[PDB]
């Protein structure tokens, strides 16, 4: 944004007489388009702590940047250090740029086939440093579509949350967001089930835990986020999670859980529009 630079650029553009004519995602994963949902909304993650006094301090907990390949349910939680998620000036720019540089280093370490053709990014709130530092990972285009995923609840898994919490450095863990929902369903249904688990965990974590793990038989693995179940058990857990998410949405918006249709309930599941020193 230098003004004289724009004068020089516009002199170049008027000399060339060149113009600018130029001024869903949960379901496109099985439509021959790999989408790795690069979301940094959980990047500035901080825990809550209380001292012996009435004042409450801010704990610099380890942030986790979500990269959700929804075709296979692959959740790459790029972890940060405990001292790297707080302290630096311009945390909406510098820490976002450092997380984007770590994501670009991970995309360079992974193959081009391992990288996706698109990135299901969130709304543009901190996307300026991401678009600045996304020149090293241009295979996936970051944009905010109509169908997103609740990446703020992507760290709500027990094993992934423990691996994020017990990490004093950028561990950058990788797991499956839907380990059992992808072994018994399609790619779009697996992305919808993982987004349904994430949306139910964002709405009501107790109802999401009772829906996904109603007993001890749904105990997942150390690299699994969704509960480990069979085909019918995973379908029943996803149906109970969708029912709990519809009940929470109806309680939030003074509506009914059964008021949504089949495609509307599928879109609501998939995430679319229905201490100190």
């Amino acid at each position: 944004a230098n003004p004289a630079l724009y004068v020089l650029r516009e002199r170049i553009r008027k000399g060339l007489q060149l113009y600018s004519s130029e001024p869903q995602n949960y379901g496109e994963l099985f439509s021959n388009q790999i989408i790795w949902f690069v979301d940094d909304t959980n990047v500035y993650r901080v825990t809550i702590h209380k001292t012996f006094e009435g004042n409450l301090t801010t704990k610099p907990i380890n942030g986790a940047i979500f990269i959700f390949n929804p075709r296979t349910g692959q959740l790459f939680l790029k972890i940060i250090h405990t001292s790297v998620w707080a302290g630096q000036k311009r945390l909406g720019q510098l820490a976002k740029w450092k997380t984007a540089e770590e994501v670009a280093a991970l995309i360079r370490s992974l193959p081009v086939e391992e990288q996706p053709k698109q990135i299901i990014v969130t709304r543009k709130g901190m996307l300026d440093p991401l678009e600045v530092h996304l020149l090293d990972f241009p295979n996936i285009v970051i944009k905010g579509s109509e169908l997103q995923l609740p990446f703020q609840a992507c760290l709500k898994v027990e094993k992934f949350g423990d691996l994020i919490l017990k990490a004093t450095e950028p561990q950058m863990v990788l797991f499956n967001l839907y380990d059992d929902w992808l072994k018994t369903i399609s790619s779009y249904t697996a992305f919808s089930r993982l987004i349904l688990i994430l949306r139910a965990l964002h709405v009501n974590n107790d109802r999401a835990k009772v829906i996904l793990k109603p007993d001890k038989t749904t105990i997942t693995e150390p690299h699994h986020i969704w509960p480990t179940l069979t085909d019918e058990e995973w379908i029943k857990v996803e149906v109970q999670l969708k029912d709990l998410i519809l009940a929470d949405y109806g309680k939030k918006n003074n509506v009914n859980v059964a008021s949504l249709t089949q495609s509307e309930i599928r879109d609501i599941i998939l995430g679319m529009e229905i201490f100190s020193s």
Binding site: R9, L16, Q17, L18, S20, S21, E22
Partner: protein
């Protein structure tokens, strides 16, 4: 198809734009780009302007 493979034989659009003055324009992409009763003492003069902008 000859035009498409003629573009493909030139090392790519990015390789062509490396040769041209593309990065001085500071466009985000090339895809938005678009190209474009009187009396006078002489009228058959050559137009220096489009050759100048090609240069």
């Amino acid at each position: 198809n000859y035009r498409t493979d003629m573009i493909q034989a030139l090392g790519g659009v990015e390789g062509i734009l490396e040769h041209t003055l593309f990065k001085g324009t500071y466009f985000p992409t090339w895809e938005g780009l678009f190209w474009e009763k009187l009396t006078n003492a002489q009228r058959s003069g050559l137009n220096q302007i489009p050759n100048r902008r090609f240069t």
